[model samples]
Target: MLQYPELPLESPLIDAELPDPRGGRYRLSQFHEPLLAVVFMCNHCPYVKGSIGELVALAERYRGKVAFVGINANDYEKYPEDAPEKMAAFAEEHGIFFPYLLDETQEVAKAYRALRTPEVFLFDERRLLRYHGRVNDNPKDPSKVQSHDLEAAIEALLRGEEPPLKEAPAIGCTIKWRPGNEPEVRIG
Candidate 1:
């Protein structure tokens, strides 16, 4: 598995102002609760497709306990699939009950240091990140997977416990950056 650089919670998250499919305003700080799962997903990524069912199922299972939000920060100008209209369609088609936001500015994704589609950062009620990793062991094939990483982590959090470990890197396509709006990654 690849190693993803994880960020720790410091100040309260500056809630992002993004359009929601249901015509509601969705913010990032709202999920800084007892437990929240912030998933970075785009309509075009197959990895995001892989977790569609799982994500919907998770929302059904942990509606109130774990708030979920999906951010689409890809450049829709280049990739129209990430556009708001299509995003609404995708969420409806997938039965996604959570908030799916359009991050046209791409600043929000950059703020979280998002690297790939389907990348997730799970946090405890106090807003401290506890797990940031893959949704499951199966990404490429999505067959009868054994490890349900995100589900288990949520369970642990709901039980007032911590995941045994930190995280597992999620593999997916790179976010399609917009022209003249891409943030530079500082790699020494």
Candidate 2:
């Protein structure tokens, strides 16, 4: 699914509490950083799996400078492997350090206008969206990546500058929407 040219819109549900794997409620307000990332990802998407290592490294590289969180909004009823229980296993297996949350109602995903796994939205210190797009240039082959999109955005924010690019074509699996809850927009 591809949704590009989306402006940096203000985030909704910053106060909505969601379950983190550690058995605590995680709200968007919990992140106190110059920059925060909300990545729409899941356990089973190959696109997400392909860059799992890169993602881990990115989190480490920006540990204190940026706050990162991953949300799995996939329909677990259809994709049982993406269920909260499995999400814990996936995070463990992949060495994910950030809070991996479950969007049980999928409202957060809709609010963020997320359409697929591997999509990303970056917010500044004021919680205003600053960037929205893919993690990097190439998801499958890190060796082929020429641009570190997300990294650049975080760095720019930290430096008190505008991001090099604000929008990048998101590439990944279609979010498994509940039968009647499919997004109104079409995904290319």
Candidate 3:
């Protein structure tokens, strides 16, 4: 069990040509939208399973304005349910409109210092991270959500203004990193 943490200011924007749920290649550079939201999630995690629909709705609502991307960096060797094949099925079942990518090496997850499922990193037009935290205030019940953290950040970016940049560590299943591929940095 890991939670989100503050990353470095000059953290490099990692990119990769990962396979999409549709058997197509998805590159980070392709998301030319003014704002980009990269979320770390997997099909097997309850946290991701519960909020996937809400995530899909968000993508639909912000279509063309914000590019929402989901990345699964879990070790499929131990959790077969998180395999690429299952990922495609999960996206289809959840009506996900954004790109669902696979980070087979878990490099992307480490690059962003993501430790929890459904962790979100919102970036501005320049691809610089502006917000890093949970999707919303409520993870179990969407109706109970009070603060739309990620949404608010997106709206602020669209308005050509700076967001509050409030940092809240996301809590969820720890990323299943393969042996020896674990991130050098660890959170207490």
Candidate 4:
């Protein structure tokens, strides 16, 4: 499966196992659920801070039906607050039940083309990419949210239908790439 597949294209949620803050290894293939939703996130961003509660609630709501995961690819060396210790505290504070992985190599983030915290990627039972983007229109205030892009995709997958919204722009702190690890560019 191509790492950078377009929307609705097939790609394993993540081909490799990742270590959570507790040193536990987790992989999407390990889950037997009909659907999987993984979000790229970090512990510090205001974006993640404001939306995390609702995201955690959504995961609880979907408990057994869909597997939820979070991965933080930010360079922890630069942002020490994203370190494993911090991650653990964040999970406990947020009451996050799903796996929150640490992508130390940042390879997983590049594979998924994840550019910011709070960006979500949903895959179907077949392990195909179904949707990728924001979880909702408003991460700061759920009360004013006009749409639920993430949930819309989840329900559509449950119904065996195409997601009404395939993707949307994500708003968050840009990934903190390690020195020399920024996305490459070639010029002729």
Q: Output the number of the lDDT-best candidate.
A: 4
Error of 1 at 129 (Å): 0.9
Better of 1 and 2 by lDDT: 2
lDDT of 1 by residue, 1-188 (tens): 32323465333444677888668887677564467788888997888888778988988888778888888999988898888899989998999888998888888888787878888888776676788878887754569567888898888877877775755777678888888765566544
lDDT of each: 0.79, 0.81, 0.81, 0.83
lDDT of 2 by residue, 97-185 (tens): 88999998898888777787799888887888888888888876778888878888887877888986445867788888888888777
TM-score each candidate.
0.88, 0.89, 0.89, 0.89
Candidate 2 runs further than 4 Å off = 1-13, 186-188
lDDT of 3 by residue, 39-99 (tens): 9999988778767877888899989888988999999989999999999899899998688
- Clashing residue pairs in candidate 2 are none
Sum up the clashes in candidate 1: 2
The per-prediction CA RMSD against the true structure, in angstroms, equals 3.4, 3.3, 3.1, 3.1
Candidate 1, residue 66: how far the Cα is off, in Å: 0.5
